[PDB]
Amino acid sequence: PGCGFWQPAWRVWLNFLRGTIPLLERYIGNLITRQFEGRSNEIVKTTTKQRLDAYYDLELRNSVMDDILEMMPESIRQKKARTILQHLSEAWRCWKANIPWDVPGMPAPIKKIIERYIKSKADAWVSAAHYNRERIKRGAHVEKTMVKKNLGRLTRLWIK
Amino acid sequence: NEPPPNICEQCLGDEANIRMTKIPQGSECKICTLPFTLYHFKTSKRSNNIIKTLICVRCATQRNICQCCMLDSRWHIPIQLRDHLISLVVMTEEAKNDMMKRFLSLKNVKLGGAQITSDPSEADNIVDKLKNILL
Amino acid sequence: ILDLEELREYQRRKRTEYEGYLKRNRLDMGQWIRYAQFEIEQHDMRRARSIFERALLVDSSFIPLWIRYIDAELKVKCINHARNLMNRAISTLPRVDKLWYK
Amino acid sequence: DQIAKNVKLDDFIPKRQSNFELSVPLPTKAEIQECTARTKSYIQRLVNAKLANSNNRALLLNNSHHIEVVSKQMDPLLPRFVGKKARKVVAPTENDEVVPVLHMDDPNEW
Amino acid sequence: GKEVEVLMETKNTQSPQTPLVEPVTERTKLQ
Amino acid sequence: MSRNVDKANSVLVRFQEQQAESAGGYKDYSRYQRPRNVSKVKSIKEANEWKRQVSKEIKQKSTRIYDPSLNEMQIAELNDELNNLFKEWKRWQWHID
Amino acid sequence: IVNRYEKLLSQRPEWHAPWKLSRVINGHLGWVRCVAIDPVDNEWFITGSNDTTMKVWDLATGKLKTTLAGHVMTVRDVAVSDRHPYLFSVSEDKTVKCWDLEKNQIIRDYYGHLSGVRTVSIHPTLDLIATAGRDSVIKLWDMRTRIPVITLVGHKGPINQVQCTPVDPQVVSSSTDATVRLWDVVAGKTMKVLTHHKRSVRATALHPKEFSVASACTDDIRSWGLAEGSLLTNFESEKTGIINTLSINQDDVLFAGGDNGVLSFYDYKSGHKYQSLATREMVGSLEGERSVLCSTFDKTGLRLITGEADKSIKIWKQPGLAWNPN
Amino acid sequence: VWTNVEDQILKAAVQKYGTHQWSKVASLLQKKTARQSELRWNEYLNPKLNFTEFSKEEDAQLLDLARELPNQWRTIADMMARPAQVCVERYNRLLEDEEKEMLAEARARLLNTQGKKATRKIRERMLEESKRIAELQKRRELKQAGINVAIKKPKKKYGTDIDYNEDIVYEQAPMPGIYDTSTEDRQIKKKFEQFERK
Amino acid sequence: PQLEARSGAKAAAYTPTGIEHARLLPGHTTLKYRKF
Amino acid sequence: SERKAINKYYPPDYNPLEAEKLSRKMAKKLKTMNKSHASIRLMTPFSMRCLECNEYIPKSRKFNGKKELLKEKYLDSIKIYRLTISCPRCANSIAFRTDPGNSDYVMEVGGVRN
Numbered sequence A: 001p002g003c004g005f006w007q008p009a010w011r012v013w014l015n016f017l018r019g020t021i022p023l024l025e026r027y028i029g030n031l032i033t034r035q036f037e038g039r040s041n042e043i044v045k046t047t048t049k050q051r052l053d054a055y056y057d058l059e060l061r062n063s064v065m066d067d068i069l070e071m072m073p074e075s076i077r078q079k080k081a082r083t084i085l086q087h088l089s090e091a092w093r094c095w096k097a098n099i100p101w102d103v104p105g106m107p108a109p110i111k112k113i114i115e116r117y118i119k120s121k122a123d124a125w126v127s128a129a130h131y132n133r134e135r136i137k138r139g140a141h142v143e144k145t146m147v148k149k150n151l152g153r154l155t156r157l158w159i160k
Numbered sequence B: 001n002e003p004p005p006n007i008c009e010q011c012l013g014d015e016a017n018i019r020m021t022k023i024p025q026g027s028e029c030k031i032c033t034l035p036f037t038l039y040h041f042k043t044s045k046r047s048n049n050i051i052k053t054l055i056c057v058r059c060a061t062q063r064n065i066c067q068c069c070m071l072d073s074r075w076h077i078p079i080q081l082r083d084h085l086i087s088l089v090v091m092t093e094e095a096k097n098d099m100m101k102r103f104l105s106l107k108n109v110k111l112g113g114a115q116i117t118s119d120p121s122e123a124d125n126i127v128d129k130l131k132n133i134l135l
Numbered sequence C: 001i002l003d004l005e006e007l008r009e010y011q012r013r014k015r016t017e018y019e020g021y022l023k024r025n026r027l028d029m030g031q032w033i034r035y036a037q038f039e040i041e042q043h044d045m046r047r048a049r050s051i052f053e054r055a056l057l058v059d060s061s062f063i064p065l066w067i068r069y070i071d072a073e074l075k076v077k078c079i080n081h082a083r084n085l086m087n088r089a090i091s092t093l094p095r096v097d098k099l100w101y102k
Numbered sequence D: 001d002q003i004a005k006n007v008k009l010d011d012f013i014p015k016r017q018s019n020f021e022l023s024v025p026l027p028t029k030a031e032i033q034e035c036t037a038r039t040k041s042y043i044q045r046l047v048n049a050k051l052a053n054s055n056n057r058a059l060l061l062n063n064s065h066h067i068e069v070v071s072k073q074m075d076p077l078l079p080r081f082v083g084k085k086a087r088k089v090v091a092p093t094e095n096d097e098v099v100p101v102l103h104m105d106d107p108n109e110w
Numbered sequence E: 001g002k003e004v005e006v007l008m009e010t011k012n013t014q015s016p017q018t019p020l021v022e023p024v025t026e027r028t029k030l031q
Numbered sequence F: 001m002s003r004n005v006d007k008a009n010s011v012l013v014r015f016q017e018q019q020a021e022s023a024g025g026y027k028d029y030s031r032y033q034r035p036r037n038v039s040k041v042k043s044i045k046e047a048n049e050w051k052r053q054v055s056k057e058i059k060q061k062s063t064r065i066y067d068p069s070l071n072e073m074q075i076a077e078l079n080d081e082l083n084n085l086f087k088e089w090k091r092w093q094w095h096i097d
Numbered sequence G: 001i002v003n004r005y006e007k008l009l010s011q012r013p014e015w016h017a018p019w020k021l022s023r024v025i026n027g028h029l030g031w032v033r034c035v036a037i038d039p040v041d042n043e044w045f046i047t048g049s050n051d052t053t054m055k056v057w058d059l060a061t062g063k064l065k066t067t068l069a070g071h072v073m074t075v076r077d078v079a080v081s082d083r084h085p086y087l088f089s090v091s092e093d094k095t096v097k098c099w100d101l102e103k104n105q106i107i108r109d110y111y112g113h114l115s116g117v118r119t120v121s122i123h124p125t126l127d128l129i130a131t132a133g134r135d136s137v138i139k140l141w142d143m144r145t146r147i148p149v150i151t152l153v154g155h156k157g158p159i160n161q162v163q164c165t166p167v168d169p170q171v172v173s174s175s176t177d178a179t180v181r182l183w184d185v186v187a188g189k190t191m192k193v194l195t196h197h198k199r200s201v202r203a204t205a206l207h208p209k210e211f212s213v214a215s216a217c218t219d220d221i222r223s224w225g226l227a228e229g230s231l232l233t234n235f236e237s238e239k240t241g242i243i244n245t246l247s248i249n250q251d252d253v254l255f256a257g258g259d260n261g262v263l264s265f266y267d268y269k270s271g272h273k274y275q276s277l278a279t280r281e282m283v284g285s286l287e288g289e290r291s292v293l294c295s296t297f298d299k300t301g302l303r304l305i306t307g308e309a310d311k312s313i314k315i316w317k318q319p320g321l322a323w324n325p326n
Numbered sequence H: 001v002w003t004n005v006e007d008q009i010l011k012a013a014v015q016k017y018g019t020h021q022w023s024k025v026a027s028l029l030q031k032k033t034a035r036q037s038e039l040r041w042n043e044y045l046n047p048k049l050n051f052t053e054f055s056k057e058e059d060a061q062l063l064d065l066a067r068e069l070p071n072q073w074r075t076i077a078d079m080m081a082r083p084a085q086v087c088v089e090r091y092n093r094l095l096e097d098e099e100k101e102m103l104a105e106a107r108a109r110l111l112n113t114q115g116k117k118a119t120r121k122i123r124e125r126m127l128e129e130s131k132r133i134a135e136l137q138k139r140r141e142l143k144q145a146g147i148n149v150a151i152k153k154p155k156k157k158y159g160t161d162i163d164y165n166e167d168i169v170y171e172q173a174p175m176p177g178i179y180d181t182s183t184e185d186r187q188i189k190k191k192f193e194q195f196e197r198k
Numbered sequence I: 001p002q003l004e005a006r007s008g009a010k011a012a013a014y015t016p017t018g019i020e021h022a023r024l025l026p027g028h029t030t031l032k033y034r035k036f
Numbered sequence J: 001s002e003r004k005a006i007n008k009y010y011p012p013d014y015n016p017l018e019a020e021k022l023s024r025k026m027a028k029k030l031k032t033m034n035k036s037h038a039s040i041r042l043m044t045p046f047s048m049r050c051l052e053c054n055e056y057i058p059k060s061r062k063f064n065g066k067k068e069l070l071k072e073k074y075l076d077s078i079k080i081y082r083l084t085i086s087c088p089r090c091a092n093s094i095a096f097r098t099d100p101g102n103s104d105y106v107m108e109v110g111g112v113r114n
Ligand SMILES: [Zn+2]
Pocket: B007, B008, B009, B010, B011, B012, B066, B067, B068, B069, B070, B071
């Protein structure tokens, strides 16, 4: 020990610090802002792997509800919306199982619409599953849970 | 976009030039607890102690008051008193609640009485009535 | 409910509960009418009126709310206000039969 | 009478149904330009304001009396906009004028 | 069926013809 | 030291408390058990604190004993506990000062 | 009244040619619930979908130019700009993205929509776009500074199509509240609120040469000049399906797609339905599915392009029907 | 081996639960198995299955099937619309304390639409109510002394909905405006003062 | 339970926060244009 | 500040032995630590009925119990514990003991096993 000549190391550290200046100013500054004035209404972002599927489902449900509203007249429709949603869910479940979803009271048009949306879901779902499988085959950052789902989903598909 | 400050004649001072600074979202208004631009002026250059605006312009408009004095824009009387007089010839109920006060502030109805004070028609009439009552 | 303070406490609590239920299902309109009814019962006509107005704002296209509100207005023998309300309703919604009939 | 005034018949009536050669003109070029300028100026201004607000770097009269407004340079350490604190605010709708919501005109199946 | 029948053509398109890198609009300005 | 109690009675915390007591006079009369035999408490402030604590305890007892399942024996037991608390409070109101 | 009916009878509509199917391009593996064309040229048209992708399509050949994979959830709408070489797209992932077309790669994801965003309209004149979602709010963006400049509070429910005109009525929203609004972006407020529909006006479109805006609830296609914000006509849409699309052609040939899939055409301003077209679907697909979800014409106007729920895009080439009112 | 009470319970559970949820049901019947339970249900319990006998023609058909799908018996059953074992049989042809306890348990289960969160919440509410009444009682007791009712402690700036009036929407100033309304309101309020006093 | 579906979303405007979001940072200041 | 924290800060004068002694001195006075029925989280192995209100708390159901030491050990040098529980509906103190002769538990005036 006893080698001086700190210059290049020093230079390197200085240059590193340059990058940080900006990052710290956004970060530390942001933190202090929060401390003084702490955020009102943040917006989550579905481009995340997590929450995507749920969001999609919700959207689909909303669409279906809208379609049903468009379809025919109603009085106190809020109550009926829930029922519609339930029906849709049941249909989806049936599809997953490969049970025919035949309900006698369901009127042709509404039923038809529900069927179409479940088909759409299947298309979106099956394709997604396939993609996941492909990824798995490759070795491409699959989530353990995701892989499990794929295994399950794919099994179900096979059974069907 | 921003509206102008409503500072009374006696509030502001006796001179033909005053310099003031505006501080956008300076403080929260005392009534509403909602950010607004502080104007603060020194009256005469050398005369000590500033005169900061304590309320938001909207609130002032609603009550029809000086943003410093907290007195009627017209008659320079405390809000209670001015309103009381009008009643004698209904008064404002500032709702002392965290959320509700803000809502009240944002409403633009001229709370109670303020309308009368604003209009030459109405204020003058009220005054006349008061005079009659007195006599 | 013996004393005034007790009543206030009760009433306040009820109001809070109603608010809580609203905040979630703002677009319900059964809850709103219930709230209005409660207010009426309490004999705070202002509050009830406000609630009805709020409900209307939430869902203007809901005849039941309108009709109940009208009834409430009329119930308290406050006809002129009721009349005004009716007029407003009519203005809002001509092609609904019911308001006119009312 | 008031009610009548509030909601008029011509609202329900389509205007083209009587006169077909009647066409709404595509707006005047100059007018369009003017509109663009107005909005462009405004939107630009708004954006500038927003930028100013963001915490990252990069005259008047009252009554008869004349009054000079200033903006003092606050210290760059202290919070720029010391007023604001991320407050929740419910707003009233404030819809004084009444929207006319106009319209026209087997239950066991549906 | 009827999309298949008569004279009207159905095109099955899996593969994109033009490459992925190439532009959909270009902006050339002076040589 | 899961579940917080352990953390509270971890040695470091105890040491800190002791230090506080030594310098400035921060005690937590919640934290220590109130003594059985009064007249082993020459200071007045301490006595007052103890009294306050007992009052608080009594209040707590009161709050719970009017619960809806009134026929359960816990409530009955508390009634005696309440009495005891009251007695303690009374005692604490001794006439030395 | 008799005074109006007689007048209507007296007046005649122009003989618009009928429409026959030409191209069908089963390429997407999902609904094709958006479609758009280039203002400048009419070589390609892109179509966002429930695939999550959006694909570009050469009109002449019908061949798939190229794909674009910049969303997670399904694309709800797109808008190629006339004034810039940007393609805006928007998906229920809450992302209003912006594709350069010199490089076919996203640039400015605009952020601000709380939930699934339904439509875009680029402002014809400004460098500003406008988007609206189930949010119940139509935000306008400065494209440079990728921030919402203003927002438009008025609506009381999810807002679907939100067209941009170059005049004062600069945005023409259309909700599930069944109001269609005319706004003043500059004022930060509404100007006129067309409430004439009964249900969710889930379709609306600006007329190219005529400064008016057809709009469609479950049945009745209204159409209006938005100068005053005054009704122009009511179309013969009496028992047609739930109107999904409502594109207008250059030559006053308003098209309407349904949830039925019954492609209905009308003379514009007349209010005269002058054709119906039965849908079609693939042998494997079901008869309930077939439904024109998105559609638009080319700038010339001889080709209507309809994205239908068969995972297809159908392009349509070109004795009129008798009048008979009520 | 299957007892009849148990079978009945299972049936009840199925109506309560769901013909594709065979874990809960299994749990409900302490001795019988999950996968067994489902099988049992398939065999006996479900009404749509025609466990009863049928005409000679049907029998003939069954026998024909048997000949022409060599003992592919599930398939045959399916074709029939009959259950399998029974069909096969046809072809071939041509303690108390426990019960009491289990029943009690089962009954409790099926009836009670409850768990942790359902039971807890109601209980909590009840407790709160009790507390409130206790408070009231206390104030009554100490009425000769001046006493104020304790407010619900705020958490993050909320409104006490007695005062202030909450987010008010307007009366909406109309054309046929008359000033008796105010008077009426006053009159109404007069009565409530009296009530308060008594 | 409270595991619950829904009726409507929201859009309510408050005072801006003044927070330095990462994405919001400047980028592509130059807008392109078409030829005409 | 982070659960895997290597070293807790000590004051500049912290005689550890002395500190310990001090703590001990202020442990007899202390409320908690100088008491029985220290808390615990446990699932119920017995699957039993609450004797008051007959609430059938099943196997593996989780509770915040009180573990207390029974002074009378099993044999000599292997301790046994009382494990208090409350029934969900009625607040009756159920408990049980762990007699390790049978490798199992014993009910203690709370409920009955079935
Ligand atoms: Zn003043």
